[PDB]
């Protein structure tokens, strides 16, 4: 060969390897992360992300009076000076004390001794995994990370001679590290469990760390979340000494009537993984975190003060990390605390960073979730990203409440507020900011997920399961309500989702019917526990070895296996194999006898019924094995033992056919 | 100048770029990180890394009684039972 063609192949190998290495660099630094699931519990009755979306889209104001069951002296601790507060309402999770201790194995003793932050975070993580199409029980042993933005709000009060009831568990139940650790301990996750203390920026920083961990291959999937609960009202009293809380409790984000910032509770978690991994594993992608950035301000006018320069710098860093121009995004979930000091600085930072060269007909639309539920605290950024995710999913930006007029402290004359809802060539992108009080500014950029059949198996079972019968009834009722609001779902898809993407718990039930007119009533009868024809219920055994049983005669009836021959191809193949084995030792074909072909002998004759029974039994047992039920033992009854002898492997198909046929003939 | 001369330079540039890219991959995956500064204030009168080195090298056990300038009810806290409510059984520890 010539030298030129020889060196050409080496050049081709070299440039292909160069492209591979460059692509490795690109996916090792600027990898888009996929939000495959999410779960939030925020004030205003919100329990699911859909609850959040219907709350924020409707414009509901989820601020109400202080809780009365928490032991607070609510009538006494209100004074519109020395140690009181001038606000009587904020965003609260009145069910924050509610937790399913038994489901996660937690004891009531540990549960009451445990911080409600951990209690909310466990359930939120489990729901986030479930909403991703993943079975949490199957996540055991995987290299799954856990990154929680939490803080020691104070539930056991370590500085006050911790109570007798919560003695021994006030470390395990209240260390902020254990908030992230307990998720991995219960779910059996193997990736690092790191909790982040950054005040009002911890959750978005946790999302950043999860993204970096996934990009480096340290994790396969990750839990990026935050939690905020208020065991005591001190957060209102300490921030009431300085006029930082709004007098009425409304976070008038970026409004001329901005006069303070009311705090709020809430938990919000995301289950995320690499976009390529999501595409390979066939997980549904809700949104795509393209880039992230975090920094500090440092030289701020006071420790607990903002800085427009730092916010602009983190915004630009997040834009550059994602490789996106500022004009690419058409929405921002601003922090929007509502403070008179904070709002103008944040608006100036957003205007300087994002809106500087945008078109003259596509202003940046700024809103805040804090106007609806108040300042969530640690869980603010990871709730704002959920809000933007559902805004992209539904293609409409919800309005931000309590904006009577844009605040005059900033020159808007580029960027506009979301006074009323607005609807939406290129993928939808939106930024989220989680600027903190400790100076740790954070920012993420999300993008719309990229655009992503088989014949329907008949009589697909619908499977339900729960730890307790009451939980099973609740599951049935919830599924019935969900299916009511859906335009004609595919039953086989529901069967697949229920069977694969949900844990098999102890108390189980099943619905097996081939018509879409009985499943609804069956689900209802499961809900109130009434019986139904197409409904099965039971208590699964923890352990036990399986047996196949092969009776003798008696289990015959004309037409048996006829429908299975057409419908089930595996049964047809097994019957064909049995027929080929039997042909040499008999003067007719099995398929003719089973199908009732004209002239074939009936089951009255002893010599034909027994081979037919043997073949049908062997084919059915092999079908059971094909469906994954491998027996641990086999037992027979007279001629049935021959069939058992075939399934045990002692006798080949030919030998078993010979024995049964000649034995019947004799 | 024919193709044999021409393709050799392209191959050299391509493999140099390949080496640079592989070096970059190693440089943002397993870079060695240098500890340029150190500071510590561990118990036993340690105020610097040299203090800790002197402590460990000399085989010093820096375990002493509780601090008496923190409002701790040290006398009514010993209780050698390991089960009584809100009481230790450890008299000494490494206190800064």
């Amino acid at each position, epitope marked *: 060969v010539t030298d030129s063609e020889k060196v050409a192949e080496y050049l081709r190998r070299a440039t292909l390897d160069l492209r591979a*290495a460059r692509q490795r660099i690109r996916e090792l630094e600027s990898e888009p992360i996929a939000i495959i699931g999410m779960a939030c519990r925020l004030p205003g009755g919100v329990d699911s992300p859909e609850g959040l979306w219907e709350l924020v889209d409707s414009g509901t104001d989820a601020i109400a009076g202080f809780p009365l069951d928490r032991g607070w002296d609510v009538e006494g601790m209100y004074d519109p000076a020395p140690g009181k507060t001038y606000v009587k309402e904020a965003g609260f999770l009145y069910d924050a004390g509610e937790f399913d201790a038994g489901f996660f194995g937690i004891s009531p003793r540990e549960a009451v001794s445990m911080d409600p932050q951990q209690r909310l975070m466990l359930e939120a993580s489990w729901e986030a995994f479930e909403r991703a199409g993943l079975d949490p029980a199957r996540q055991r042993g995987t290299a799954t990370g856990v990154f929680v933005g939490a803080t020691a709000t104070g539930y056991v009060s370590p500085a006050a001679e911790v109570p007798e009831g919560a003695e021994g568990f006030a470390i395990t139940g209240n260390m902020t590290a254990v908030t992230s650790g307990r998720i991995s301990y219960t779910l059996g996750l193997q990736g690092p469990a790191v909790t982040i203390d950054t005040a009002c920026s911890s959750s978005l920083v946790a999302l950043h760390l999860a993204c970096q961990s996934l990009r480096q291959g340290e994790c396969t999937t990750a839990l990026a979340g935050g939690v905020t609960v208020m065991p005591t009202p001190t957060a209102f009293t300490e921030f009431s000494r300085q006029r930082g809380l709004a007098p009425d409790g409304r976070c008038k984000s970026f409004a001329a009537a901005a006069d303070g910032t009311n705090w709020a509770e809430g938990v919000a978690v995301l289950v995320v993984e690499r976009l390529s991994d999501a595409r390979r594993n066939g997980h549904r992608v809700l949104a795509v975190v393209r880039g992230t950035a975090i920094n500090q301000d440092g030289a701020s006018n006071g420790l607990s003060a903002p800085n427009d320069l730092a916010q602009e710098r983190v915004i630009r860093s997040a834009l550059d990390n994602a490789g996106l121009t500022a004009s690419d995004v058409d929405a921002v979930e601003a922090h929007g605390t509502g403070t008179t000091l904070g709002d103008p600085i944040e608006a100036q930072a957003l205007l300087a960073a994002y809106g500087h060269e945008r078109p003259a007909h596509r202003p940046l639309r700024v809103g805040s979730l804090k106007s609806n539920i108040g300042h969530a605290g640690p869980a603010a950024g990871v709730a704002g990203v959920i809000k933007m995710v559902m805004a992209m999913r539904h293609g409409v930006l919800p309005r931000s409440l309590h904006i009577d007029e844009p605040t005059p402290q900033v020159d808007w004359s580029a960027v506009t507020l979301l006074t009323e809802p607005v609807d939406w060539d290129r993928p939808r992108r939106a930024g989220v900011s989680a600027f903190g009080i400790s100076g740790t500014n954070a920012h993420v950029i999300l993008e719309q997920a990229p655009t992503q059949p088989a014949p329907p198996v008949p009589a697909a079972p619908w499977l339900l399961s729960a730890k307790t019968p009451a939980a099973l009834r609740a599951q049935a009722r919830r599924l019935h309500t969900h299916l009511a609001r859906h335009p004609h779902p595919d039953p086989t898809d529901i069967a697949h989702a229920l069977a694969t993407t949900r844990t098999p718990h102890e108390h189980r039930a099943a619905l097996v019917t081939d018509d879409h007119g009985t499943r609804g009533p069956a689900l209802a009868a499961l809900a109130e526990g009434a019986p139904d024809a197409c409904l099965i219920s039971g208590t699964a055994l923890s352990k036990g070895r399986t047996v196949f049983v092969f009776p003798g005669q008696g289990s015959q009836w004309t037409g048996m296996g006829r429908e299975l021959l057409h419908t089930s191809p595996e049964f047809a193949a097994y019957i064909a194999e049995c027929e080929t084995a039997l042909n040499d030792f008999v003067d007719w074909s099995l398929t003719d006898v089973l199908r009732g072909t004209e002239g074939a002998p009936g089951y009255d004759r002893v010599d034909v019924v027994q081979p037919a029974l043997f073949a049908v039994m062997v084919s059915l047992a092999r079908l059971w094995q094909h469906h994954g039920i491998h027996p641990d033992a086999v037992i027979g009854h007279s001629q049935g033992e021959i069939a058992a002898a075939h399934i045990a492997g002692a006798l080949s198909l030919q030998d078993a056919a010979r024995i049964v046929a000649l034995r019947s003939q004799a | 100048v024919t193709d044999s001369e021409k393709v*050799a330079e392209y191959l050299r540039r391509a493999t140099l770029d390949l080496r640079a890219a592989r070096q970059r991959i190693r440089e943002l995956e397993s870079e060695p990180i240098a500890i340029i500064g150190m500071a510590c204030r561990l118990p036993g009168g340690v105020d610097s890394p040299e203090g800790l080195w002197e402590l460990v090298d000399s085989g010093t056990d820096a375990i002493a009684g509780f601090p008496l300038d923190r409002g701790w009810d040290v006398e009514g806290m010993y209780d050698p039972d390991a089960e009584a409510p809100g009481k230790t059984y450890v008299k000494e520890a490494g206190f800064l």
Partner: antibody
Amino acid sequence: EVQLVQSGGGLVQPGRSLRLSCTASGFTFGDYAMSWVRQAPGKGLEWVGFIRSKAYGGTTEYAASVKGRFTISRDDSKSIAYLQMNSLKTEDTAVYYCTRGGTLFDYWGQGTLVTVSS
Amino acid sequence: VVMTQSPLSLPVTPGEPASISCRSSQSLLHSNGYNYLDWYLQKPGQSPQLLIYLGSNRASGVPDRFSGSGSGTDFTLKISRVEAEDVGVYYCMQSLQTPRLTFGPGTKVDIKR
């Protein structure tokens, strides 16, 4: 993702023709020079032949032991390499491997076990 | 004619590196400053695969532990970490002179005990 899949083996008595097809999927098949390399049972690798790309001319070269008897062709439209083995001898039993690149065998096929005897 | 020779066999163990050396009968360093040599691996039951080309340039997808080195007549393939998956036959095969009649006897690699 580059893939090479061979086929067309099977038992053959000596002294007849045979065809080995090898389909390529995952790269520009036209530009590459394409090679066949056999390996007898227990022996080392032994190059059989190769064909240049259609741009270079598409000419073929073969190992010294296979002058005339063996032939190489390529369907560039559907991107398959064909090894036509005419007048097989008893010592041609081997595992014929399908490879990309005339001089540098960067990727190799699964290999087709062609056994020949009377 | 150019001739290349390597050790017939080299037992190895997982726990300590190894180096498969081989020498040519001629200076393989082409006028363009490249040693026209390649290194291939053939695992038991799998097809041969490329490891190194032009003496030291590693192919993409190969483990980084492999590394080609040397020049002129003398070349080596150094493996930092030995694994059971890497057992097989290693062929150092020249390309300065064409056509190549055969790969050569190779160098069997096996678990040492």
